[PDB]
Design a protein around this ligand. Structure first.
Ligand SMILES: [Ca+2]
Ligand SMILES: [Cl-]
Ligand SMILES: [Cl-]
Ligand SMILES: [Cl-]
Ligand SMILES: [Cl-]
Lengths: 293, 289
């Protein structure tokens, strides 16, 4: 496996829930970056160097993904709820001495990030969420057209061991098909092949696949209920926020986020779902500008 | 593979789109019985005997399922649309001289049946559907709760080869998990083991699995659009109808049919195997007078 962050250090950070693996580089105000599914920290490799010119950049594997430890799950999928993931990432930031920091997330990592902002807002100076709406909004919109377009939320959420058994025959084919499908061109051309190999090796481990299904189970059940509480109570994030989305992505999104956040700006970018790999210069620039302003 | 139909013949019926396999027994008025997913005609083995006391009973494999031939599909999944399946079964019944008959179906076979009643109501004396609502109604109901409960409607409808590739690694597990999870018991104890082997053997074949996905792609697209036209026109099935459902709906069918009666049966989805006495008794009494 290639080193895609040349000159960045590496840290295995202890927490009460297990170790978090991270690459660490640059100098300046602290900025945590969080990937999602079906990827690892390496998806930030095209934008990290440029962010590292202006910030101390912490590129972490999510609890249970990549090289971070995989805690044993339970009947409510607790450790892979976004509430618990956020708590665990807060502890890992405190081990480095960061109690107030900037945060950007993508896909599941964006879900950890907004949940973090709702539960513990004093932790964040600013927040960016890339190509997502809140988990409550995804589910509230569900109808035949969305059910057919974005099927995997309900598939990976079926009780164990159904999705796990289906995915075990030919795991490479599933992970590569997902990566390609969500891009603008529908192929693997946007990704560095050494980044594709990181994703494929993680996806080849049955234990790593189980974590991803637990993540999506949490997505269908506890995460949804936690969001519902907040929207029914009218709670909005007060942290200044940016919503960036792909014109051809999965997530207008800015109008949805205005219901969830009192100080939000946003823009589309010409891209599929994978903004930091499909549109690196534009994504790096939008983030540097937002976090420096 | 076991003969589960004592005193029934075995027939291959020709049609313009391929052969339909059927077990045929009994005498008297004609009654066609249609299975669904993930099963074959064998799923009527416990109720067909009682029905054959009074009727001439035709127990057919759906187009592409079991031992029926598999017509070539196309980009709109045409031969696995319920409209096309019904036209093909209408042709099969004509090869036997049956142009007006009674019809009961379960799961996919019930969708063929109600679409047959909507398209060609003159073909049917009476109609029974087991544990379904119309395809349009399931889709209209597709919120978070339904997306989770009935996930396979969206998964099996994903463009080829995604579900076919996944089902290929351990098909025995997938079929047995479906059978089990929709029963009251949650295991395979309601089923005869010989019937389970018919279902496993059919599901073990990649070409039979592809047909199943074509059926669900039809269910997501043309079949939905067909139902939508009837709902927008206010069309109602005129044929006398019975809706049976597992306690583990009559109001829904009253919107789709002008002469409908209905009852729950103590059962999961697989009424003719979980609740064979009660299912047979209800069908016999409906179809008699
Ligand atoms: Ca320490
Ligand atoms: Cl979303
Ligand atoms: Cl770019
Ligand atoms: Cl069905
Ligand atoms: Cl019974």
């Amino acid at each position: 496996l290639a080193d895609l962050f040349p000159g960045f250090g590496s840290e295995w950070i202890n927490t009460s829930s297990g170790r978090i693996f991270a690459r660490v580089g640059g100098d300046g105000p602290p900025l945590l970056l969080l990937h999602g599914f079906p990827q690892t920290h390496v998806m930030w490799h095209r934008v990290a160097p440029k962010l590292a010119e202006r910030f101390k950049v912490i590129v972490a594997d999510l609890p249970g993904y990549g090289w971070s430890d995989m805690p044993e799950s339970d009947e409510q999928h607790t450790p892979y709820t976004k509430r618990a993931m956020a708590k665990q990432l807060i502890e890992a930031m405190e081990q480095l001495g960061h109690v107030h920091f900037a945060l950007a997330g993508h896909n599941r990592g964006a879900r950890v990030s907004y949940r973090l902002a709702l539960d513990s807002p004093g932790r964040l100076s600013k927040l960016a969420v890339l190509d997502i709406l809140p988990t409550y909004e995804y589910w509230q919109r569900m109808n035949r057209a969305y059910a057919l377009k974005i099927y995997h939320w309900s598939f990976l959420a079926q009780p164990a061991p159904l999705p796990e058994n289906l995915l075990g025959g030919d795991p490479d084919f599933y992970v590569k098909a997902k990566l390609a499908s969500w891009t603008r061109a529908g192929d693997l051309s946007a990704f560095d092949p050494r980044a594709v190999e990181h994703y494929r090796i993680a996806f080849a481990d049955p234990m790593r696949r189980h974590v991803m299904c637990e993540d999506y189970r949490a997505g269908a059940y506890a995460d949804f209920e936690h969001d519902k509480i907040d929207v029914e109570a009218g709670n909005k994030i007060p942290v200044p926020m940016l919503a960036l989305w792909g014109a051809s992505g999965i997530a207008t999104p800015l109008d949805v986020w205005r219901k969830w956040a009192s100080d939000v700006q946003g823009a589309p970018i010409e891209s599929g779902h994978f903004l930091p790999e499909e549109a690196p210069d534009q994504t790096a620039e939008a983030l540097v500008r937002f976090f420096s302003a």
